[PDB]
Amino acid sequence: DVEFDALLGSYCNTLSLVRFLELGLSVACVCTKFPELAYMNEGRVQFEV
Amino acid sequence: DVEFDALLGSYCNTLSLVRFLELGLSVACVCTKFPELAYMNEGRVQFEV
Numbered sequence: 001d002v003e004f005d006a007l008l009g010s011y012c013n014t015l016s017l018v019r020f021l022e023l024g025l026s027v028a029c030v031c032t033k034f035p036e037l038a039y040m041n042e043g044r045v046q047f048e049v
Numbered sequence: 050d051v052e053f054d055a056l057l058g059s060y061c062n063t064l065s066l067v068r069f070l071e072l073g074l075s076v077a078c079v080c081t082k083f084p085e086l087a088y089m090n091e092g093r094v095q096f097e098v
Contacts, residue, residue: 040052041052041054044054044055044056045057045058045059046056046059046060047059048062
């Protein structure tokens, strides 16, 4: 008697990487970066009308 | 310890300027200018039909 078992095939994914600046939605953002933020208390913006 | 606050940006408007003679309504007038209006008692126009 000759018997055995087998693997047949094996399958991974490939994850999908998303850059945010690719999205259409990135229009709404104005993205600037502080390297140092956590030192900062309240921030401000001034508007004249 | 180090902390701070910050101004981020300052935003004005720009006042729109409107010439009246730009308007489609300017058709209705006939705009002439008296340097001295205040010396005029009743003024007149004459129509013959």
